[PDB]
Amino acid sequence: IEFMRILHTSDWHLGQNFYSKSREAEHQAFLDWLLETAQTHQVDAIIVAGDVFDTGSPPSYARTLYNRFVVNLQQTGCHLVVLAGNHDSVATLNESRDIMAFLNTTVVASAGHAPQILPRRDGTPGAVLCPIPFLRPRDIITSQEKQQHLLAAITDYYQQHYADACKLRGDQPLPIIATGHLTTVGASKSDAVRDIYIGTLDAFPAQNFPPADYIALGHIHRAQIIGGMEHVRYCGSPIPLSFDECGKSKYVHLVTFSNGKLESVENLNVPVTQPMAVLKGDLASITAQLEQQEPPVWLDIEIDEYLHDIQRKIQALTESLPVEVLLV
């Protein structure tokens, strides 16, 4: 009878320079869809599980996309939780932390944020959130085996915060939601996923996560269930961030809680607004491949031996065609 609904997204990488192309149009369309989606499902909170911006110094149009979304989301009463990823600068996201608080937005850029009650739209307690962004080792390494140390440090961090979440919840029938931004053991990764904790943690075993009712992760671009646990998920990126991910579905997760427990996780397809394609073969295999649309499809030609000559060759075969070649 008491519901709480959140949307789980991550890895926006606003401002990404994609082979000289801007993703602004795609991100604008996505953010507009995310807005209508929040209204359609009467979502209580949207959680963005890290990598909001592609770098620590996003271009003005990306900062504008982000600000305008937060503003437009006000017409819904939906709360917004923005967590830093490894691509984000902490200082950059903290620029507007306190300003965002006036707009029902919680910006969490570094480790150490206490658990907080997420209200439902009507203001009553809906869930207890442990807002955990990408954890910089410097921020969590107690007493500042290095590999074993970081694993223990992250595990312990989640344990302390889960414990505090339980205390904050008290006797209330509220679900506990934790977030995270890292790479788990067994995760399937794409090209656009950058190595993190280089030399200090190959991957995080999801069995070490505390028993929150939902764990909303970011960093990995393909939506997947982790460690066979339906409550531990990457939502993946909302638009394709690399050519190896085109053709593949993009999602945000609609996560519903009933009486303090996880009820369902639904995969909401994010409309794809910019056609991309990857071509493999040789000059004729290529030539046949690219033959017979408002935006011009972006192309990754994975095609006589000197790759320099191949480029000029393809640059000839690709001229005045409704496509656009980005990578060779």
Read off the DSSP letter of residue 297: P
Helix (H) or strand (E) holding 70: helix 60-72
Paired with 82 in beta bridges are 48, 107
Give the tokens for residue 107. Answer: 């910006």
Give the tokens for residue 176. Answer: 């506990």
With a CB cutoff of 8 Å and minimum separation 6, the contacts of 240 are 246, 248, 250, 272, 276
CATH of domain 1-273: 3.60.21.10
E-state strands within 120-173? 125-130
Q: What is the gyration radius of the CA atoms in the chain, in angstroms?
A: 21
Domain segments of the chain as ranges = 1-273, 274-328
CATH of domain 274-328: 3.30.160.720
How far is the C-alpha of 237 from the C-alpha of 278, rounded, in Å? 19
Q: How far is CA 158 from CA 165, 181, 209, 231, in A?
A: 10, 12, 7, 16
The pairing of beta strand 21-22 with beta strand 17-18: antiparallel
Q: How far is CA 61 from CA 23, 28, 74, 203, in A?
A: 10, 10, 20, 34
Q: Which value in Å is the resolution of this experimental model? A: 1.8
Strand order, beta sheet including 324-327: 276-280, 298-302, 324-327
Phi-psi region of 281 (alpha: psi -120 to 50; beta: other; left: phi over 0): left
Asked how this structure was determined, the answer is X-ray
Single-letter residue type at 183? T
Read off the DSSP letter of residue 204: B
How far is the C-alpha of 312 from the C-alpha of 310, rounded, in Å? 6
Read off the DSSP letter of residue 243: G
Under 8 Å between Cβ of 138 and 90: no
Under 8 Å between Cβ of 103 and 74: yes
Helices (H) and strands (E) in the chain, counts: 8, 17
Paired with 204 in beta bridges are 184
Find the largest Cα–Cα distance for the chain.
Answer: 71
With a CB cutoff of 8 Å and minimum separation 6, the contacts of 125 are 117, 118, 119, 172, 174
How far is the C-alpha of 18 from the C-alpha of 59, rounded, in Å? 14
Residue 13, SS3? coil
Number of neighbours of residue 211 by Cβ within 10 angstroms: 10
Strand order, beta sheet including 251-258: 105-108, 79-83, 45-49, 3-9, 251-258, 261-269
Single-letter residue type at 180? G
Helix (H) or strand (E) holding 49: strand 45-49
Under 8 Å between Cβ of 310 and 328: yes
E-state strands within 166-213? 176-181
Strand order, beta sheet including 229-234: 116-119, 125-130, 176-181, 214-218, 229-234, 224-226
How far is the C-alpha of 100 from the C-alpha of 107, rounded, in Å? 7
